Amino acid sequence: KSVTRRNDIPEAAASPPSLLSFLRKNVGKDLSSIAMPVTSNEPISILQLISETFEYAPLLTKATQRPDPITFVSAFAISFLSIYRDKTRTLRKPFNPLLAETFELIREDMGFRLISEKVSHRPPVFAFFAEHLDWECSYTVTPSQKFWGKSIELNNEGILRLKFKTTGELFEWTQPTTILKNLIAGERYMEPVNEFEVHSSKGDKSHILFDKAGMFSGRSEGFKVSIIPPPSSNRKKETLAGKWTQSLANETTHETIWEVGDLVSNPKKKYGFTKFTANLNEITEIEKGNLPPTDSRLRPDIRAYEEGNVDKAEEWKLKLEQLQRERRNKGQDVEPKYFEKVSKNEWKYITGPKSYWERRKKHDWSDISQLW
Numbered sequence: 001k002s003v004t005r006r007n008d009i010p011e012a013a014a015s016p017p018s019l020l021s022f023l024r025k026n027v028g029k030d031l032s033s034i035a036m037p038v039t040s041n042e043p044i045s046i047l048q049l050i051s052e053t054f055e056y057a058p059l060l061t062k063a064t065q066r067p068d069p070i071t072f073v074s075a076f077a078i079s080f081l082s083i084y085r086d087k088t089r090t091l092r093k094p095f096n097p098l099l100a101e102t103f104e105l106i107r108e109d110m111g112f113r114l115i116s117e118k119v120s121h122r123p124p125v126f127a128f129f130a131e132h133l134d135w136e137c138s139y140t141v142t143p144s145q146k147f148w149g150k151s152i153e154l155n156n157e158g159i160l161r162l163k164f165k166t167t168g169e170l171f172e173w174t175q176p177t178t179i180l181k182n183l184i185a186g187e188r189y190m191e192p193v194n195e196f197e198v199h200s201s202k203g204d205k206s207h208i209l210f211d212k213a214g215m216f217s218g219r220s221e222g223f224k225v226s227i228i229p230p231p232s233s234n235r236k237k238e239t240l241a242g243k244w245t246q247s248l249a250n251e252t253t254h255e256t257i258w259e260v261g262d263l264v265s266n267p268k269k270k271y272g273f274t275k276f277t278a279n280l281n282e283i284t285e286i287e288k289g290n291l292p293p294t295d296s297r298l299r300p301d302i303r304a305y306e307e308g309n310v311d312k313a314e315e316w317k318l319k320l321e322q323l324q325r326e327r328r329n330k331g332q333d334v335e336p337k338y339f340e341k342v343s344k345n346e347w348k349y350i351t352g353p354k355s356y357w358e359r360r361k362k363h364d365w366s367d368i369s370q371l372w
Helices: 019-025 046-054 058-063 069-084 275-280 300-306 310-329 356-361
Strands: 041-045 093-095 102-107 112-120 125-132 135-147 152-157 159-164 170-174 178-181 189-192 195-200 205-210 222-228 238-243 247-250 256-259 339-343 346-349
Touching: 041 046, 041 300, 046 069, 046 093, 046 102, 046 112, 046 125, 046 135, 046 275, 058 069, 058 135, 069 159, 069 170, 069 189, 069 195, 069 205, 069 222, 069 238, 069 247, 069 256, 102 356, 112 339, 112 356, 125 346, 135 346, 238 256, 300 310
Parallel strands: 041 093
Antiparallel strands: 102 112, 112 125, 125 135, 135 152, 135 159, 152 178, 159 170, 170 195, 178 189, 195 205, 205 222, 222 238, 238 247, 247 256, 339 346
């Protein structure tokens, strides 16, 4: 089957405040814990933002059908950076999810479904489990940030664990470090820095290096990928090259491996959102009447903000934060329901009759409290 998606969002209803303005007043605790006006946000939650990691999920499906899978897994690993191609996207940040807030994403068109939940508040920890007939991916992540004096370093702490359900081959990697520049003056923007590697359980390794730029060459957009197969294997060494803002190709054959999709119309007025981003917070026939009380699509502050009702969005943002603080101080914080902690910095999807997907089949949410 299929569903018609909006592929668009209302234009931003307010001008973007300056992040630096808040950094100077909160010298110490960074962003995630700082009381920010709703105007500093974009209309999605962090769970929805991280779900964009799967915008190009078909690359994973293609990987399970190719002899050199790490080439496509590498493309997939780098692809998420493309959401920042329109610098407008770097002006605001997603809403901080509430503890126990969830976000499901079923994309029949790409053959996968994803479920996510905020499993810890201090520090923030988000758990993700994406499944396709031929692959699945787990991720326990904690976003982090540290200003270097003029620029801020952004990182997602946690290993993305991909598993081919066809062969069992595993791939792992930590998302690359990115930097937010021009916080003082000019047009703010983000760019990846340093390098990172993707590792296969079969020995293969991929080394991704981003071009260095920090004084003239403008925003760094290019990168190179060196594929190194293990010895005694029939796979050979290969190199890939491209720009995370546009495409990636095999340097030897010049064959295109990945290309960016579309942004919404007039993106400068719509947070620089991709069509995929614009579709994250939409309730379609897929979700209607099937969501637990905790889905990000049900948050009133995000919804009001999306629809341009700023004053109401601010009031709701404060209200949700206040309700959570009250629950917390009483020692009555809500416990996550769909993931279980297996170790330090590692959560795992709970299977069984009370799993998210099993509950969804029968609207079994009677034991799920209303966070707002």
